[PDB]
Design a protein around this ligand. Structure first.
Ligand code: UFQ
Ligand code: UFQ
Ligand code: MG
Ligand code: MG
Lengths: 195, 196
C-alpha cells in the first residue's frame, strides 16, 4: 500500500543505475513538490533498520530540499535482481510529452484556467522562461508545429524560423531546413537571406 | 495497493497527450507482463467510475497485457488541479542516459547472470535494443562520454563500432561531431577505413 515514510528512514541505493544527478533539474523537481507534493510514491525495500530506495531517489532528494519530513512510498518485498529490474523499468518505460504538447498544456493553463506565465511556472516547477518560450512555438503554422512535435525540427530550428515574417516563407524555409537536416546556424542564415 | 477494475477507468478527453506511439506502448505492455504496474495511476471520481489524471499509457498498456485491474490513487481535486498534476507527472522527470542504460543491462548480465533475452523480457525492451546498448560499452571512454551527453547518437555510435582499430575510431568520432555528419556519412567514412 501507499504509506508515508519518514524521510530519514530511507537511504539511497549506492548501486542505483543513475550516476549523474543534474542539480538544476533536481531543483525544478523540488519546486514542483512545493506546489503539488509528491505525485507518485517512491518504491523502497526494507534494508538494515530502514528502507533502501528501489526507484525514486530524485523524488527523495528533492523532497529533502523542499523541507518535507515524509515521502509517499510503496514497500516491495523483492530480490536484489528484481529490485534492479524495477529500477530500470521505472526509468526506461516512459514517453515524454513532445514540445507542442507541453506548450499546449501551458496554453490551457493560461487561457482556460486564467493563470499568468509566472503562476504557471510556480505550479509546474519550471522556469518562467521555459513556459514563455514554449508558448511562442504555438504561433508556428500547423505543419511546422507538426515537425517540432515529431522531432524532425528541433526547438532551436523552430525558434529561428519564428523570425520569418511571412507564413508561406516560414513554411517554405522549414521544408528546406528539416529536409536536409540543415543546421540551426544554417537555418538562421537562411532566415536572414529570406528577409 | 488499491486496485481498480480496469473497466471502471476512462480517459480524460482533455488530457495533455495527443500522440500515442504504438511501438512504445507495446514495450510498456511487455514490461507490465513481467513486473506489473510499478507506479499507480492517478484518477478522479467521474460518473460511476474514474477519469484518468495521470497514467493513460499505463492503463492502455495494462489492457493490452490482459490485466483486469490497475493500481491507482484516487485524488479529490478540481479540474485545474487535475490538469496541473497531469502536466507535472510528465514534465518533472530525468531519463537515464544511453550509457547508464547500457551499464544497467550489463549489470543484469554480468552480476545477476541473466541472458540478454532474459533482460529483454524482464525490462520489456526489444531484443535488439538490449544488444545494441551493450555493444556501446566496447567504445573507448571518450567516445562513450559523447554518447552519454548526446553529442553522438546511438546510430552514429553503432556505425563507428565497425572501425576495427581504436585509434581510427576515436579520430572518426571527432570528425562526425565536428562536421555534423549524418549517420549515413559516418557509415561511408567507416567503410573506407576498413579498406585501409
Ligand atoms: N511533484 C512531482 C513531480 C514529479 N513526480 C514523479 O517523479 C518521478 C521522477 O522520475 P525520475 O526523474 O526518474 O526520478 P526518480 O524519483 O524516479 O529517481 P530515480 O530512482 O530514477 S534516480 C516521475 O514519475 C514524476 O511523475 C512526482 O511524483 N511528484
Ligand atoms: N511496468 C511499468 C512500466 C512503467 N511504469 C511507469 O509508468 C509511467 C509511464 O509514464 P508515461 O509514459 O508518461 O505514461 P503514462 O502512464 O503516465 O500516461 P499519461 O497520462 O502520460 S498519457 C512511468 O512513471 C513509469 O515509471 C510503471 O508504473 N510500470
Ligand atoms: Mg526514476
Ligand atoms: Mg505520464
Amino acid at each position: 500500500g501507499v504509506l508515508k515514510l519518514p524521510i530519514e528512514s530511507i537511504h539511497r541505493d549506492k548501486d542505483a543505475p543513475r550516476t549523474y544527478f543534474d542539480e538544476e533539474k533536481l531543483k525544478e523537481l523540488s519546486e514542483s513538490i512545493k506546489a503539488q507534493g509528491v505525485l507518485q510514491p517512491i518504491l523502497v525495500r526494507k534494508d538494515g533498520d530502514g528502507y533502501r530506495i528501489i526507484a525514486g531517489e530524485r523524488r527523495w532528494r528533492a523532497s529533502q530540499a523542499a523541507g518535507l519530513k515524509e515521502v509517499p512510498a510503496i514497500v516491495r518485498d523483492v530480490t536484489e535482481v528484481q529490485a534492479f529490474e524495477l529500477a530500470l523499468v521505472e526509468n526506461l518505460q516512459r514517453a515524454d510529452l513532445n514540445p507542442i504538447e507541453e506548450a499546449e498544456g501551458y496554453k490551457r493553463l493560461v487561457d482556460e484556467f486564467k493563470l499568468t506565465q509566472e503562476q504557471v511556472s510556480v505550479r509546474v516547477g519550471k522556469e518562467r522562461s521555459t513556459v514563455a518560450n514554449a508558448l511562442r512555438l504555438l504561433a508556428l503554422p500547423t505543419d511546422v508545429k507538426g515537425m517540432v512535435a515529431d522531432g524532425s525540427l528541433s526547438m532551436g530550428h523552430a525558434r529561428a524560423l519564428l523570425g520569418v515574417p511571412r507564413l508561406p516563407e516560414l513554411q517554405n524555409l522549414a521544408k528546406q531546413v528539416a529536409d536536409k537536416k540543415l543546421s540551426v546556424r544554417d537555418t538562421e542564415r537562411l532566415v536572414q537571406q529570406s528577409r
